[PDB]
Design a protein around this ligand. Structure first.
Ligand SMILES: CO[C@@H]1O[C@@H]2CO[C@](C)(C(=O)O)O[C@H]2[C@H](O)[C@@H]1NC(C)=O
Length: 165
């Protein structure tokens, strides 16, 4: 029965998550940018970084932005598409929510969204969130609309990696 900290240690050693300078603090109560999560997903599923392509219009989404290869890589993979197709905003500094994370992971694992699912998640996300709860990636008592904590993301990422194999 591994702890969240032991799961983090494992994922860090595998380069999927990172820690923080000068400390052993994995900061498991803190949250994570959608940019950082994109990089998590790339490391977790072994995707190819995509350089010199920019599919979004956010301020400072350009070549000087370290996250673009990652965000592009998950966009090409179909795991993420940003918050508005018309204006092409990804929101890379915005924090990843439990239901957003649920979408990326169910899709990556090729699990089926639950049609007509009922739960506290935003309408677009109810099927993904329910599917993630069922697979054990988050607890049914998690707030789907909340920023996901690192801990929650470690546990989701660890479970996902195990299913993946
Ligand atoms: C506000 O609209 C939502 O934004 C979500 C943001 O995060 C992810 C995981 C993503 O694809 O980046 O999911 C997005 C939702 O699918 C949804 N976006 C749209 C265009 O409907």
């Amino acid at each position: 029965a591994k702890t969240t900290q032991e799961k983090f240690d494992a994922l860090k050693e595998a380069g999927v998550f990172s820690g923080y300078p000068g400390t052993t603090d994995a900061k498991l109560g803190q949250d994570m940018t959608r940019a950082e999560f994109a990089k998590v997903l790339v490391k977790l599923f072994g995707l190819k970084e995509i350089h010199g392509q920019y599919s979004y219009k956010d301020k400072n989404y350009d070549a000087k932005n370290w996250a673009a290869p990652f965000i592009e890589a998950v966009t090409a993979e179909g795991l993420m598409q940003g918050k508005d197709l018309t204006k092409k905003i990804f929101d890379f500094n915005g924090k990843i929510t439990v239901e957003e994370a649920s979408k990326t992971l169910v899709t990556a694992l090729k699990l089926e969204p639950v049609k007509d699912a009922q739960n506290k998640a935003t309408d677009w996300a109810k099927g993904y969130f329910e599917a993630a709860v069922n697979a054990g990636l988050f607890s049914k008592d998690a707030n789907p609309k909340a920023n996901a904590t690192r801990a929650q993301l470690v546990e989701a990422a660890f479970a996902a990696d195990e299913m993946s194999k």
